[PDB]
Amino acid sequence: TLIELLIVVAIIGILAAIAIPQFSAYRVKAYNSAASSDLRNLKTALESAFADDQTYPPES
Amino acid sequence: TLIELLIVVAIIGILAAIAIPQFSAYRVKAYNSAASSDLRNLKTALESAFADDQTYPPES
């Protein structure tokens, strides 16, 4: 019936706007926490290399 | 769930900064204590050599 096809339309419009959130910060935090962990790891690498050669490794 | 991956990120950031200390003095003291012991040993060597030859050994 036409009234049924007037409520189908009235629910499609509702379920098409459910305040979809932006997933931008929630991922840049992950990127940042990857970089920070990587740096804290690289520090271990550097300080072990010094304890090998009494010198931090040359660049490149 | 996304909230779980928001706390994993919040703990990775914490455990990546635990005030990692500089291990520079704690090793130069060891180097110094090696050199001092070596010198105190060399003194014994010199003073035994004198008691052999009535003279400290010539240089080189």
PDB file of C-alpha atoms in Angstrom:
ATOM      1  CA  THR A   1       0.000   0.000   0.000  1.00  0.00           C
ATOM      2  CA  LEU A   2       1.021   3.618  -0.555  1.00  0.00           C
ATOM      3  CA  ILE A   3       1.095   4.277   3.195  1.00  0.00           C
ATOM      4  CA  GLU A   4       3.606   1.448   3.652  1.00  0.00           C
ATOM      5  CA  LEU A   5       5.801   3.070   0.989  1.00  0.00           C
ATOM      6  CA  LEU A   6       5.464   6.331   2.904  1.00  0.00           C
ATOM      7  CA  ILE A   7       6.920   4.828   6.081  1.00  0.00           C
ATOM      8  CA  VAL A   8       9.656   2.879   4.290  1.00  0.00           C
ATOM      9  CA  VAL A   9      10.785   6.275   2.993  1.00  0.00           C
ATOM     10  CA  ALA A  10      10.447   7.762   6.485  1.00  0.00           C
ATOM     11  CA  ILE A  11      12.726   5.105   8.021  1.00  0.00           C
ATOM     12  CA  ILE A  12      15.299   5.129   5.206  1.00  0.00           C
ATOM     13  CA  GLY A  13      15.772   8.838   5.864  1.00  0.00           C
ATOM     14  CA  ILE A  14      16.236   8.237   9.591  1.00  0.00           C
ATOM     15  CA  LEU A  15      18.738   5.391   9.246  1.00  0.00           C
ATOM     16  CA  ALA A  16      20.744   7.379   6.669  1.00  0.00           C
ATOM     17  CA  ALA A  17      21.760   9.981   9.297  1.00  0.00           C
ATOM     18  CA  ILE A  18      22.986   8.359  12.516  1.00  0.00           C
ATOM     19  CA  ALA A  19      25.711  10.935  13.277  1.00  0.00           C
ATOM     20  CA  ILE A  20      28.563   9.109  11.583  1.00  0.00           C
ATOM     21  CA  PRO A  21      31.777  10.067  13.418  1.00  0.00           C
ATOM     22  CA  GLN A  22      35.081  11.239  11.970  1.00  0.00           C
ATOM     23  CA  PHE A  23      37.843   8.660  12.348  1.00  0.00           C
ATOM     24  CA  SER A  24      40.821  10.984  12.045  1.00  0.00           C
ATOM     25  CA  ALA A  25      42.230  11.489  15.531  1.00  0.00           C
ATOM     26  CA  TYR A  26      41.587   7.860  16.475  1.00  0.00           C
ATOM     27  CA  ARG A  27      44.194   6.795  13.886  1.00  0.00           C
ATOM     28  CA  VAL A  28      46.763   9.598  14.134  1.00  0.00           C
ATOM     29  CA  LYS A  29      47.155   8.604  17.783  1.00  0.00           C
ATOM     30  CA  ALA A  30      48.050   5.103  16.570  1.00  0.00           C
ATOM     31  CA  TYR A  31      50.569   6.531  14.098  1.00  0.00           C
ATOM     32  CA  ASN A  32      52.118   8.654  16.855  1.00  0.00           C
ATOM     33  CA  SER A  33      52.341   5.704  19.247  1.00  0.00           C
ATOM     34  CA  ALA A  34      54.092   3.707  16.526  1.00  0.00           C
ATOM     35  CA  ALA A  35      56.686   6.432  15.962  1.00  0.00           C
ATOM     36  CA  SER A  36      57.311   6.921  19.695  1.00  0.00           C
ATOM     37  CA  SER A  37      57.828   3.190  20.280  1.00  0.00           C
ATOM     38  CA  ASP A  38      60.178   3.099  17.295  1.00  0.00           C
ATOM     39  CA  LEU A  39      62.278   5.940  18.712  1.00  0.00           C
ATOM     40  CA  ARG A  40      62.451   4.350  22.170  1.00  0.00           C
ATOM     41  CA  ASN A  41      63.661   1.169  20.443  1.00  0.00           C
ATOM     42  CA  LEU A  42      66.260   3.028  18.384  1.00  0.00           C
ATOM     43  CA  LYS A  43      67.643   4.472  21.619  1.00  0.00           C
ATOM     44  CA  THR A  44      68.377   0.933  22.831  1.00  0.00           C
ATOM     45  CA  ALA A  45      70.083   0.183  19.527  1.00  0.00           C
ATOM     46  CA  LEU A  46      72.267   3.299  19.760  1.00  0.00           C
ATOM     47  CA  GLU A  47      73.266   2.755  23.367  1.00  0.00           C
ATOM     48  CA  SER A  48      74.198  -0.870  22.727  1.00  0.00           C
ATOM     49  CA  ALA A  49      76.299   0.168  19.732  1.00  0.00           C
ATOM     50  CA  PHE A  50      78.153   2.667  21.923  1.00  0.00           C
ATOM     51  CA  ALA A  51      78.794  -0.031  24.514  1.00  0.00           C
ATOM     52  CA  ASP A  52      80.343  -1.979  21.651  1.00  0.00           C
ATOM     53  CA  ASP A  53      82.602   0.629  20.054  1.00  0.00           C
ATOM     54  CA  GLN A  54      82.893   3.406  22.700  1.00  0.00           C
ATOM     55  CA  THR A  55      81.303   5.598  20.007  1.00  0.00           C
ATOM     56  CA  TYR A  56      77.862   6.120  18.557  1.00  0.00           C
ATOM     57  CA  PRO A  57      77.674   4.894  14.962  1.00  0.00           C
ATOM     58  CA  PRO A  58      78.456   7.293  12.117  1.00  0.00           C
ATOM     59  CA  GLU A  59      75.526   8.729  10.199  1.00  0.00           C
ATOM     60  CA  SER A  60      74.135   7.041   7.078  1.00  0.00           C
TER      61      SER A  60
ATOM     62  CA  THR B   1      36.562  -2.887  19.360  1.00  0.00           C
ATOM     63  CA  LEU B   2      37.686   0.663  18.601  1.00  0.00           C
ATOM     64  CA  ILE B   3      37.799   1.525  22.309  1.00  0.00           C
ATOM     65  CA  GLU B   4      40.229  -1.346  22.913  1.00  0.00           C
ATOM     66  CA  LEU B   5      42.456   0.060  20.155  1.00  0.00           C
ATOM     67  CA  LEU B   6      42.224   3.432  21.888  1.00  0.00           C
ATOM     68  CA  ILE B   7      43.653   2.064  25.138  1.00  0.00           C
ATOM     69  CA  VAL B   8      46.321  -0.061  23.447  1.00  0.00           C
ATOM     70  CA  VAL B   9      47.542   3.224  21.960  1.00  0.00           C
ATOM     71  CA  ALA B  10      47.267   4.911  25.366  1.00  0.00           C
ATOM     72  CA  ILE B  11      49.476   2.277  27.037  1.00  0.00           C
ATOM     73  CA  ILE B  12      52.033   2.069  24.216  1.00  0.00           C
ATOM     74  CA  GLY B  13      52.617   5.793  24.665  1.00  0.00           C
ATOM     75  CA  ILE B  14      53.084   5.386  28.418  1.00  0.00           C
ATOM     76  CA  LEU B  15      55.500   2.452  28.222  1.00  0.00           C
ATOM     77  CA  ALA B  16      57.549   4.236  25.531  1.00  0.00           C
ATOM     78  CA  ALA B  17      58.654   6.948  28.006  1.00  0.00           C
ATOM     79  CA  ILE B  18      59.850   5.470  31.306  1.00  0.00           C
ATOM     80  CA  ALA B  19      62.653   8.004  31.913  1.00  0.00           C
ATOM     81  CA  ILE B  20      65.441   6.003  30.312  1.00  0.00           C
ATOM     82  CA  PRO B  21      68.692   6.966  32.078  1.00  0.00           C
ATOM     83  CA  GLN B  22      72.021   7.959  30.555  1.00  0.00           C
ATOM     84  CA  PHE B  23      74.708   5.324  31.064  1.00  0.00           C
ATOM     85  CA  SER B  24      77.752   7.540  30.622  1.00  0.00           C
ATOM     86  CA  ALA B  25      79.194   8.195  34.069  1.00  0.00           C
ATOM     87  CA  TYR B  26      78.450   4.644  35.216  1.00  0.00           C
ATOM     88  CA  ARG B  27      81.011   3.361  32.679  1.00  0.00           C
ATOM     89  CA  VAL B  28      83.662   6.096  32.762  1.00  0.00           C
ATOM     90  CA  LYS B  29      84.044   5.294  36.458  1.00  0.00           C
ATOM     91  CA  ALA B  30      84.830   1.707  35.438  1.00  0.00           C
ATOM     92  CA  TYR B  31      87.376   2.922  32.881  1.00  0.00           C
ATOM     93  CA  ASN B  32      89.002   5.147  35.510  1.00  0.00           C
ATOM     94  CA  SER B  33      89.152   2.329  38.061  1.00  0.00           C
ATOM     95  CA  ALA B  34      90.829   0.134  35.448  1.00  0.00           C
ATOM     96  CA  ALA B  35      93.498   2.746  34.724  1.00  0.00           C
ATOM     97  CA  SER B  36      94.157   3.421  38.422  1.00  0.00           C
ATOM     98  CA  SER B  37      94.568  -0.285  39.211  1.00  0.00           C
ATOM     99  CA  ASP B  38      96.898  -0.610  36.226  1.00  0.00           C
ATOM    100  CA  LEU B  39      99.089   2.241  37.476  1.00  0.00           C
ATOM    101  CA  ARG B  40      99.234   0.841  41.016  1.00  0.00           C
ATOM    102  CA  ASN B  41     100.341  -2.465  39.463  1.00  0.00           C
ATOM    103  CA  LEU B  42     102.982  -0.800  37.295  1.00  0.00           C
ATOM    104  CA  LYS B  43     104.424   0.780  40.439  1.00  0.00           C
ATOM    105  CA  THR B  44     105.061  -2.707  41.842  1.00  0.00           C
ATOM    106  CA  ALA B  45     106.726  -3.689  38.579  1.00  0.00           C
ATOM    107  CA  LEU B  46     109.002  -0.630  38.630  1.00  0.00           C
ATOM    108  CA  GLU B  47     110.003  -1.003  42.259  1.00  0.00           C
ATOM    109  CA  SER B  48     110.826  -4.684  41.817  1.00  0.00           C
ATOM    110  CA  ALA B  49     112.940  -3.876  38.761  1.00  0.00           C
ATOM    111  CA  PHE B  50     114.878  -1.315  40.802  1.00  0.00           C
ATOM    112  CA  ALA B  51     115.454  -3.884  43.537  1.00  0.00           C
ATOM    113  CA  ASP B  52     116.930  -6.032  40.780  1.00  0.00           C
ATOM    114  CA  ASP B  53     119.256  -3.583  39.033  1.00  0.00           C
ATOM    115  CA  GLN B  54     119.642  -0.674  41.519  1.00  0.00           C
ATOM    116  CA  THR B  55     118.102   1.412  38.715  1.00  0.00           C
ATOM    117  CA  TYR B  56     114.670   1.954  37.252  1.00  0.00           C
ATOM    118  CA  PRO B  57     114.426   0.537  33.730  1.00  0.00           C
ATOM    119  CA  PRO B  58     115.263   2.751  30.754  1.00  0.00           C
ATOM    120  CA  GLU B  59     112.365   4.165  28.771  1.00  0.00           C
ATOM    121  CA  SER B  60     110.909   2.349  25.754  1.00  0.00           C
TER     122      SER B  60
END
